[PDB]
């Protein structure tokens, strides 16, 4: 509808450059298809993948325009505060085209009381039929959240997040022109994304398989102490 301005196009290009840059080591994708299928193997694979996703999330975030101008402690607080929500959005993207990854998730020590509601959430995200540009912008928007815990200069984060929201609103009009409520529906899903921060945290208190440990990076970012 309303076209992206030239500077908005440039911002989108930087975000898409960064979103498509890093991925998962093929050694890890080899394990998803070939490795033994047991709760123990699944726990180790899935936490290895989640650790890699945090590393990719950090690299993505560092290339968001303006992020490296923010206060350094605020940078850390934004990354840690968004890791789970960004993982949910990525999970949604993957599962809304590997059923083998789903089957491993379902035999990983995680209760069906958690998995079933979360996959229903991923499906509710899939019904929005988002493009990769929309997934990328929504991910950048959740990372640059001015209301996250521990942020000292919230106005500085807000001035980075506001232009992303403007671009996303235009993408919704461009990609789903026959559904003028699309952007509002995306933002409604953002709100429920936040409620699953707590569920994930509550799930972690009981997720254990053969008394295995989470990796050091996951212990940091998921607060497993």
């Amino acid at each position: 509808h309303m076209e992206l301005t030239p500077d908005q196009q440039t911002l989108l290009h930087f975000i898409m450059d960064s979103y498509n840059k890093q991925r998962m080591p093929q050694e890890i994708t080899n394990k998803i298809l070939k490795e033994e299928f047991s709760a123990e193997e699944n726990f180790l694979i899935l936490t290895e993948m989640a650790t890699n996703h945090v590393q990719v999330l950090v690299e993505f975030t560092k290339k968001l325009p303006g992020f490296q101008t923010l206060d350094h402690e605020d940078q850390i607080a934004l990354l840690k505060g968004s890791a789970v929500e960004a993982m949910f959005l990525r999970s949604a993207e993957i599962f809304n085209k590997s059923d083998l990854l789903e089957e491993r998730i379902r035999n990983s020590g995680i209760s069906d009381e958690y998995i079933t509601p979360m996959f229903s959430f991923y499906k509710s995200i899939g019904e929005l039929k988002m493009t990769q540009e929309e997934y990328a912008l929504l991910t950048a928007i959740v990372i640059l959240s001015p209301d996250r815990q521990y942020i000292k200069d919230r106005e500085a984060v807000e001035k980075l997040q506001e232009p992303l929201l403007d671009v996303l609103q235009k993408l919704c009009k461009i990609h789903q022109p026959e559904n003028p409520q699309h952007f509002a529906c995306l933002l409604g899903r953002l709100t429920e994304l936040r409620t699953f921060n707590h569920h994930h945290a509550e799930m972690l208190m009981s997720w254990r398989v053969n008394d295995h440990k989470f990796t050091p990076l996951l212990c940091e970012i998921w607060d497993v102490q």
Binding site: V58, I76, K80, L217, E220, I221
Partner: peptide
Amino acid sequence: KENALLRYLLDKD
């Protein structure tokens, strides 16, 4: 330091 690995990754080029 709190979140030592996260800091390492953020500062590493």
